[PDB]
Amino acid sequence: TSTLQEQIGW
Amino acid sequence: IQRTPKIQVYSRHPAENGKSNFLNCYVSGFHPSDIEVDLLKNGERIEKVEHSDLSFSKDWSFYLLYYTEFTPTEKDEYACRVNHVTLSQPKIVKWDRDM
Amino acid sequence: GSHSMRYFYTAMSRPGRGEPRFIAVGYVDDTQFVRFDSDAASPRMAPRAPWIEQEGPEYWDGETRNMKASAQTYRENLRIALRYYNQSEAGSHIIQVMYGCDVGPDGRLLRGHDQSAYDGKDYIALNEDLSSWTAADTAAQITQRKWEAARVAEQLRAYLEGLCVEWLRRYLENGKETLQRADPPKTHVTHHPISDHEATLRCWALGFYPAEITLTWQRDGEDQTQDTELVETRPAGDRTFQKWAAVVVPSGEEQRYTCHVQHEGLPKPLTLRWEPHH
Q: Which residues pair up as cystines (chain B)?
């Protein structure tokens, strides 16, 4: 994907 | 923390009376994102108006462009009405072909 | 020559008005190509440039599924932010995320970006090395330690160094016509009298891409930054930009003033003056 795939919680 | 929007009202091309053009209101450098912008012809709100998708610059300040199709004339007055949290009363900026 | 791709995320919490709004916008240089809004009836990544339309429905689906997950992440990132700052549910707050890649004429990556902001203030940013974090406050330091522990930097460096450069290189060639061709500004000077002894000289640049441009006023060749009114570069709505610079001149000194325009479209920096004969 062009966007960042990874999901990170604060 | 709140930063007041900066307003510019202008046409897409140099104004020629009786010839179709686009009226632009550019708002920038404002936070938070909630803002109310209207384009006025003879002091009344223009029915159909479009705006770009909301984005921000590197200093995190939001910017938006509101545009409509219009045909300038000597008789009619065009203005941009902006309301924001930073503003106590909405600020009206009238269109000048010169700027 | 040098090019960049960046993505801008805005997650705004609105109490009592439902789910926080998530807006994602994608930019290649000064051109926007993609967009997403959760408030849409059928949120989907949408195209905002003609060249991006060539992509497959699979690509669009991938963008769309990524945005849905990201909205859910930042909705909970918004509530984590409430805890860090001890803020009430009643207030409205914003999380802004900016990430992107800088490439040179070759297209090899020059710089990697990832800055996170909370309520219009710096929160946490990926450092230039792409391995470490910079935290604005103690609340971000809590988030910093989690990202160090979860090795978040390793994934961003991988995305910035690879997937981002490979998609940015692809967008630049698919829109080689629009993205890599430079429109020069069309320039002219206008005279507006303020009075009988004073007048305003306005230098105009219109329909130029990219947005970067330099407008300067010189009187006898001496610079006048102090006395020049310079407006923000603004879009014309046709993916080109406009800018102008103005100086207030005493009557009879107009010929001393000169305007200089610098742009990537121009072969040589132009020098202009007021031409009232025409």
A: 25-80
Is the CB of residue C190 less than 8 Å away from at least one CB of chain B?
yes
> Pick from B8, B53, B99: which is nearest to C25 by CB?
B53
Strands of B6-99, DSSP E: 6-11, 21-30, 35-41, 44-45, 50-51, 55-56, 62-70, 78-84, 91-94
Q: Which helix (H) or strand (E) holds C81?
A: helix C57-85
End residue of a domain, out of C136, C158, C181: C181
Resolution of the entry in angstroms:
2.9
Tell me, yes or no, whether C244 lies in a domain: yes
Q: Is residue C278 included in any domain, yes or no?
A: no
Interface contact C251, partner A, CB < 8 A: no
3-state secondary structure of B23: strand
Q: What CATH number does the domain containing C222 carry?
A: 2.60.40.10
| B to C contact (≥3 Cβ pairs closer than 8 Å) | yes
Q: Is B93 on the interface with C (CB under 8 A)?
A: no
Number of domains chain B is built from: 1
Statement to judge: residues C18 and C145 lie in one domain: yes
**CB proximity B60 to C under 8 Å:** yes
Looking at the structure of chain C, the number of domains it has is 2
